[PDB]
Protein backbone atom coordinates (compact mmCIF):
# COMPACT_ATOMS: atom_id res chain seq x y z
CA UNK A 1 0.00 0.00 0.00
CA UNK A 2 0.88 3.68 -0.18
CA UNK A 3 -2.27 5.22 1.28
CA UNK A 4 -0.85 8.01 3.42
CA UNK A 5 2.55 8.20 1.71
CA UNK A 6 0.78 9.14 -1.52
CA UNK A 7 -0.32 12.50 -0.15
CA UNK A 8 3.10 12.98 1.40
CA UNK A 9 4.96 12.29 -1.86
CA UNK A 10 2.72 14.72 -3.73
CA UNK A 11 3.29 17.29 -0.98
CA UNK A 12 7.06 16.70 -1.23
CA UNK A 13 6.84 17.28 -4.98
CA UNK A 14 4.91 20.48 -4.27
CA UNK A 15 7.63 21.67 -1.89
CA UNK A 16 10.31 20.61 -4.36
CA UNK A 17 8.43 22.60 -6.99
CA UNK A 18 8.30 25.66 -4.72
CA UNK A 19 12.01 25.34 -4.01
CA UNK A 20 12.90 24.49 -7.61
CA UNK A 21 11.02 27.48 -9.04
CA UNK A 22 12.51 29.87 -6.47
CA UNK A 23 15.89 28.39 -7.37
CA UNK A 24 15.54 28.72 -11.14
CA UNK A 25 13.90 32.15 -10.99
CA UNK A 26 16.52 33.61 -8.65
CA UNK A 27 19.51 32.23 -10.59
CA UNK A 28 18.39 34.55 -13.37
CA UNK A 29 19.32 37.49 -11.19
CA UNK A 30 15.84 38.21 -9.92
CA UNK A 31 15.61 37.99 -6.17
CA UNK A 32 13.66 39.68 -3.41
CA UNK A 33 13.55 39.49 0.38
CA UNK A 34 10.19 37.74 0.11
CA UNK A 35 11.91 35.07 -1.98
CA UNK A 36 14.97 34.67 0.25
CA UNK A 37 12.89 34.14 3.39
CA UNK A 38 10.48 31.84 1.56
CA UNK A 39 13.50 29.95 0.19
CA UNK A 40 14.57 28.95 3.66
CA UNK A 41 10.98 28.49 4.80
CA UNK A 42 9.92 26.05 2.05
CA UNK A 43 13.28 24.32 2.43
CA UNK A 44 12.49 23.62 6.07
CA UNK A 45 9.11 22.32 4.95
CA UNK A 46 10.78 20.13 2.31
CA UNK A 47 13.05 18.61 4.96
CA UNK A 48 10.05 18.20 7.28
CA UNK A 49 8.21 16.53 4.39
CA UNK A 50 11.15 14.13 4.10
CA UNK A 51 10.44 13.20 7.71
CA UNK A 52 6.73 12.94 6.93
CA UNK A 53 7.54 10.50 4.12
CA UNK A 54 9.44 8.14 6.41
CA UNK A 55 6.84 8.84 9.10
CA UNK A 56 3.92 7.10 7.40
Amino acid sequence: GSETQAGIKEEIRRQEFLLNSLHRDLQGGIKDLSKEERLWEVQRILTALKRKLREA
Binding site: L19, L22, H23, R24, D25, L26, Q27, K31, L33, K35, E36, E37, L39, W40, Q43, R44, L46, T47, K50
Partner: protein, 178 residues
Protein backbone atom coordinates in the same frame (compact mmCIF):
# COMPACT_ATOMS: atom_id res chain seq x y z
CA UNK B 1 12.40 35.67 25.39
CA UNK B 2 14.72 32.83 24.45
CA UNK B 3 12.82 31.44 21.46
CA UNK B 4 15.32 33.19 19.21
CA UNK B 5 18.08 31.37 21.05
CA UNK B 6 16.72 27.84 20.74
CA UNK B 7 16.89 28.25 16.99
CA UNK B 8 20.20 28.42 15.15
CA UNK B 9 20.90 29.10 11.47
CA UNK B 10 24.24 27.91 10.10
CA UNK B 11 25.38 28.00 6.48
CA UNK B 12 28.38 25.93 5.42
CA UNK B 13 30.33 27.12 2.37
CA UNK B 14 33.43 25.97 0.53
CA UNK B 15 35.28 25.93 -2.79
CA UNK B 16 33.05 23.15 -4.00
CA UNK B 17 33.82 20.03 -2.04
CA UNK B 18 36.46 19.99 0.70
CA UNK B 19 34.21 17.86 2.86
CA UNK B 20 31.40 20.16 3.97
CA UNK B 21 28.87 17.35 3.51
CA UNK B 22 30.55 14.71 5.70
CA UNK B 23 30.85 16.92 8.77
CA UNK B 24 27.12 17.51 8.73
CA UNK B 25 26.17 13.82 8.52
CA UNK B 26 28.72 13.13 11.28
CA UNK B 27 27.10 15.69 13.58
CA UNK B 28 23.65 14.30 12.79
CA UNK B 29 23.90 10.52 12.30
CA UNK B 30 27.43 9.78 13.58
CA UNK B 31 27.84 8.03 10.23
CA UNK B 32 30.47 8.47 7.55
CA UNK B 33 29.29 9.35 4.06
CA UNK B 34 29.37 6.05 2.18
CA UNK B 35 27.45 7.37 -0.81
CA UNK B 36 25.34 10.49 -0.50
CA UNK B 37 25.45 12.66 -3.60
CA UNK B 38 22.58 15.28 -3.44
CA UNK B 39 23.21 18.05 -0.86
CA UNK B 40 22.51 20.61 -3.58
CA UNK B 41 19.72 22.19 -1.60
CA UNK B 42 19.00 19.02 0.34
CA UNK B 43 19.79 19.45 4.02
CA UNK B 44 18.42 18.33 7.37
CA UNK B 45 18.11 19.85 10.84
CA UNK B 46 19.73 18.39 13.94
CA UNK B 47 17.98 18.07 17.29
CA UNK B 48 20.43 18.66 20.12
CA UNK B 49 19.70 19.19 23.80
CA UNK B 50 22.07 21.44 25.72
CA UNK B 51 21.73 21.03 29.48
CA UNK B 52 17.96 20.71 29.26
CA UNK B 53 16.70 22.67 26.27
CA UNK B 54 16.02 20.86 23.02
CA UNK B 55 17.65 23.16 20.52
CA UNK B 56 17.23 23.08 16.75
CA UNK B 57 20.05 23.93 14.39
CA UNK B 58 19.02 24.62 10.80
CA UNK B 59 21.81 23.61 8.42
CA UNK B 60 22.23 24.13 4.68
CA UNK B 61 24.87 22.42 2.57
CA UNK B 62 24.58 24.82 -0.33
CA UNK B 63 25.77 24.42 -3.91
CA UNK B 64 28.47 26.96 -4.66
CA UNK B 65 29.96 27.05 -8.12
CA UNK B 66 28.37 29.65 -10.40
CA UNK B 67 25.12 28.19 -11.72
CA UNK B 68 23.14 27.57 -8.55
CA UNK B 69 24.03 30.92 -7.00
CA UNK B 70 20.41 30.97 -5.89
CA UNK B 71 21.36 28.32 -3.35
CA UNK B 72 24.61 29.87 -2.13
CA UNK B 73 24.31 33.64 -2.40
CA UNK B 74 20.54 34.02 -2.40
CA UNK B 75 20.31 31.88 0.76
CA UNK B 76 22.93 33.93 2.64
CA UNK B 77 20.28 36.38 3.88
CA UNK B 78 18.53 34.22 6.48
CA UNK B 79 21.68 32.81 8.05
CA UNK B 80 23.18 33.84 11.39
CA UNK B 81 26.53 32.08 11.44
CA UNK B 82 28.75 30.85 8.64
CA UNK B 83 31.26 28.02 8.50
CA UNK B 84 34.06 28.59 6.01
CA UNK B 85 35.33 25.11 5.21
CA UNK B 86 38.49 24.58 3.19
CA UNK B 87 41.40 22.16 3.14
CA UNK B 88 45.09 22.95 3.61
CA UNK B 89 45.87 21.13 0.36
CA UNK B 90 44.09 23.89 -1.50
CA UNK B 91 45.74 27.29 -1.36
CA UNK B 92 42.99 28.45 -3.71
CA UNK B 93 40.13 27.86 -1.29
CA UNK B 94 42.28 29.53 1.37
CA UNK B 95 42.43 32.68 -0.74
CA UNK B 96 38.75 32.24 -1.56
CA UNK B 97 37.78 32.57 2.12
CA UNK B 98 37.97 36.36 1.80
CA UNK B 99 35.78 36.17 -1.30
CA UNK B 100 33.14 34.14 0.57
CA UNK B 101 33.37 36.60 3.45
CA UNK B 102 32.70 39.60 1.23
CA UNK B 103 29.96 37.71 -0.62
CA UNK B 104 28.22 37.44 2.74
CA UNK B 105 28.97 41.10 3.54
CA UNK B 106 27.36 42.16 0.25
CA UNK B 107 24.06 40.59 1.29
CA UNK B 108 24.29 41.13 5.06
CA UNK B 109 25.57 44.30 6.72
CA UNK B 110 22.71 46.19 8.42
CA UNK B 111 21.94 43.34 10.83
CA UNK B 112 23.38 42.71 14.30
CA UNK B 113 26.58 40.66 13.89
CA UNK B 114 27.88 38.02 11.51
CA UNK B 115 29.48 35.03 13.33
CA UNK B 116 32.27 33.53 11.23
CA UNK B 117 34.11 30.30 11.93
CA UNK B 118 36.80 29.01 9.60
CA UNK B 119 36.97 25.23 9.56
CA UNK B 120 40.02 23.42 8.29
CA UNK B 121 39.18 19.94 7.05
CA UNK B 122 41.53 17.05 6.24
CA UNK B 123 44.11 17.47 9.02
CA UNK B 124 44.89 13.85 8.10
CA UNK B 125 46.91 14.75 4.98
CA UNK B 126 49.70 16.56 6.89
CA UNK B 127 52.49 16.37 4.30
CA UNK B 128 50.17 17.35 1.43
CA UNK B 129 49.89 20.78 3.05
CA UNK B 130 50.00 23.49 0.40
CA UNK B 131 48.91 26.28 2.72
CA UNK B 132 50.52 26.71 6.16
CA UNK B 133 48.15 26.63 9.13
CA UNK B 134 50.41 29.33 10.54
CA UNK B 135 48.91 31.99 8.26
CA UNK B 136 45.49 30.33 8.39
CA UNK B 137 45.45 30.77 12.16
CA UNK B 138 46.83 34.26 11.60
CA UNK B 139 43.73 34.92 9.47
CA UNK B 140 41.62 33.86 12.44
CA UNK B 141 43.44 36.50 14.49
CA UNK B 142 43.09 38.94 11.59
CA UNK B 143 39.30 38.60 11.60
CA UNK B 144 39.04 38.17 15.36
CA UNK B 145 37.65 34.66 14.99
CA UNK B 146 38.74 31.12 15.67
CA UNK B 147 40.35 28.53 13.42
CA UNK B 148 39.80 24.86 14.17
CA UNK B 149 41.37 21.78 12.59
CA UNK B 150 38.86 19.05 11.86
CA UNK B 151 38.35 15.87 9.88
CA UNK B 152 35.43 13.57 9.18
CA UNK B 153 37.99 10.83 8.65
CA UNK B 154 39.28 10.84 12.21
CA UNK B 155 36.12 12.54 13.48
CA UNK B 156 37.78 15.24 15.54
CA UNK B 157 36.50 18.67 16.63
CA UNK B 158 33.36 18.14 14.56
CA UNK B 159 31.14 18.71 17.60
CA UNK B 160 33.20 21.74 18.61
CA UNK B 161 32.77 23.75 15.39
CA UNK B 162 29.00 23.20 15.37
CA UNK B 163 28.32 23.90 19.05
CA UNK B 164 30.88 26.71 19.30
CA UNK B 165 29.38 28.72 16.44
CA UNK B 166 25.79 28.13 17.55
CA UNK B 167 26.65 29.47 21.01
CA UNK B 168 27.95 32.70 19.46
CA UNK B 169 24.57 33.03 17.74
CA UNK B 170 23.04 33.51 21.19
CA UNK B 171 25.32 36.46 21.88
CA UNK B 172 24.33 37.94 18.52
CA UNK B 173 20.62 37.40 19.24
CA UNK B 174 21.01 39.00 22.67
CA UNK B 175 22.76 41.95 21.00
CA UNK B 176 25.16 44.32 22.74
CA UNK B 177 23.82 47.90 22.78
CA UNK B 178 26.39 48.90 25.38
Amino acid sequence: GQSSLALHKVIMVGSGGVGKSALTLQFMYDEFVEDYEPTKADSYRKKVVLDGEEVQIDILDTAGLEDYAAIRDNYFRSGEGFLLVFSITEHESFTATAEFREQILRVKAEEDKIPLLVVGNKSDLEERRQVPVEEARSKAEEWGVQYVETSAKTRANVDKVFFDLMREIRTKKMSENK
